[PDB]
Design a protein around this ligand. Structure first.
Ligand SMILES: NC(=O)c1ccc[n+]([C@@H]2O[C@H](COP(=O)([O-])OP(=O)(O)OC[C@H]3O[C@@H](n4cnc5c(N)ncnc54)[C@H](OP(=O)(O)O)[C@@H]3O)[C@@H](O)[C@H]2O)c1
Ligand SMILES: NC(=O)c1ccc[n+]([C@@H]2O[C@H](COP(=O)([O-])OP(=O)(O)OC[C@H]3O[C@@H](n4cnc5c(N)ncnc54)[C@H](OP(=O)(O)O)[C@@H]3O)[C@@H](O)[C@H]2O)c1
Ligand SMILES: CC1=Nc2c(nc(N)[nH]c2=O)NC1
Ligand SMILES: CC1=Nc2c(nc(N)[nH]c2=O)NC1
Lengths: 246, 246
């Protein structure tokens, strides 16, 4: 019943993008996260200490493939999100696939309370979207004039964000290939609301002990079955996994 | 830099034990845990909902290989630990390796506050060890007379358990091949105190959302590097991993 996995194929920068290609059409919400063996998502507030050159390479690839990168306001404040940076060949590849040179960033906030000089607004080639509620969309739009496109993502309830509506709002703007990088509250809502199509997860070969949070937080509790699409590795013992619903 | 993993070898019940063999001599502390993709260790207080036939098989194998199974009093109370059960061929294999027919159970408690009719005491072929502090060892020994061997595992401080001493106390009794199954507080102390030699981790193909705890809890924070020894899989997309310090 059990099979040993081992390295069978060295990947070229030609086949690697193929492994992480989005579907032909339709919207697709992919998450990319890293965590330790004992399930911790941070080493001192951030993920980076666990990320080596392999994970950086995968991380930048997934950004290169995406139409839009969706992130919660907390992770934007804490990981210090600036704009999305794309190098020359990355821009070239994107153009080859019919995409803009650099993917958009979309910042999720229920409150709408964002400030004008954040790096997402300042250190950026392309103005970001702000995904918020019907209730606060107009005021938010007014405060962030010239800095960001503000989009109401409410469903039945004008005072909350409906995550399926959020996804539809991106799709309607031609941004159907979606990548989210967190943080844990937002991922938690995508999981709880069952709109996550795929999770790419880097399993870093460390144990970090009990303090760290998981890659998801919140009161949500589900049991969503995924299919293992692939597992990659490198020389340092990292596992780069891709799982797809259902 | 990246390599695709895939199934290269179907394992027989002859080679599987070889993959998880303990070292020739010296003490070795192995942990076995299961968790979801998003790092959750429980689905409603227990692990079992995530465990399929493959994980049950690995779980029973690791118990078959161990000299002693070490568990915290919390997990004993909550997962409803009875005795360790071994089937006929398992008993045979154990005898072949020079081991007793059924491995001992050792229950860790700083307080020493255990009751006489727990299933570890009642539904058991072999009396368990209770690993506690110098401070409470004598009274605990008196309360549990006839039910358990009580062992003081204090180092410098008679009011605490020193986890390296705990390990030495098992070794001194010929129980050098140690398996721990938790719970999260105990694993947290083994990690924090750096006495964990190996982690076998079943990665279950589910996301569970933000509520669940990790396989480790506590205030501990470390960054302990492990080496990936192997990754197995089955038809259902589970990954059975084995990582070794350092
Ligand atoms: O903090 P963290 O570490 O947990 O990382 P984080 O998810 O990036 O930050 C969480 C914050 O982003 C917003 N957010 C996340 N999910 C949301 C949702 N489904 N709807 C509306 N806003 C959402 C909220 O902003 P607001 O607090 O501004 O509403 C929330 O407070
Ligand atoms: O609860 P849970 O879900 O976290 O599972 P758990 O680890 O199995 O239960 C935790 C309990 O087991 C004991 N324990 C765990 N680690 C210990 C250590 N290093 N030294 C002494 N006792 C230890 C403690 O018992 P006591 O509370 O009885 O001291 C602790 O309260
Ligand atoms: C904030 C954040 N960072 C990372 C991430 N995923 C990977 N692989 N690596 C990362 O470093 N997503 C979340
Ligand atoms: C309480 C507990 N259960 C399990 C475990 N490990 C595996 N693989 N599977 C389990 O079900 N250790 C902790």
């Amino acid at each position: 019943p059990l099979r040993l996995l081992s390295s069978v194929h060295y990947l070229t920068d030609g086949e690697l993008p193929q492994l992480y290609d989005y579907p032909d059409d339709g919207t697709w919400l992919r998450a990319n996260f890293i965590s330790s063996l004992d399930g911790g998502a941070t080493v001192d507030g951030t993920s980076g200490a666990m990320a080596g050159p392999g994970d950086r390479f995968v991380f930048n690839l997934l950004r290169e493939l995406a139409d839009v990168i969706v992130v919660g306001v907390g992770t934007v404040r804490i990981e210090g999100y600036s704009g999305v940076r794309m190098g020359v060949v990355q821009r070239q590849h994107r153009q080859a696939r019919g995409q803009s040179e650099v993917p958009q960033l979309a910042i999720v906030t229920r409150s709408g309370r964002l400030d004008r000089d954040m790096a997402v607004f300042t250190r950026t080639e392309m103005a970001p979207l702000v995904l918020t509620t019907t209730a606060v969309a107009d005021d938010t739009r007014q405060r962030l004039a010239g800095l960001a496109e503000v989009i109401a993502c409410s469903g039945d309830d004008p005072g909350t964000v409906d995550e399926a509506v959020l996804v539809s709002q991106l799709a309607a703007r031609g941004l159907r290939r979606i990548l989210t990088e967190g943080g844990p509250t937002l991922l938690g809502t995508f999981v709880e609301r069952d709109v996550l199509d795929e999770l790419c997860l880097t399993i870093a070969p460390y144990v970090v002990g009990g303090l760290a949070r998981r890659i998801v937080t919140g009161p949500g509790q589900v049991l969503t079955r995924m299919r293992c699409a692939h597992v990659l590795t490198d020389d340092s013992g990292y596992l780069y996994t891709r799982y797809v619903k259902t």
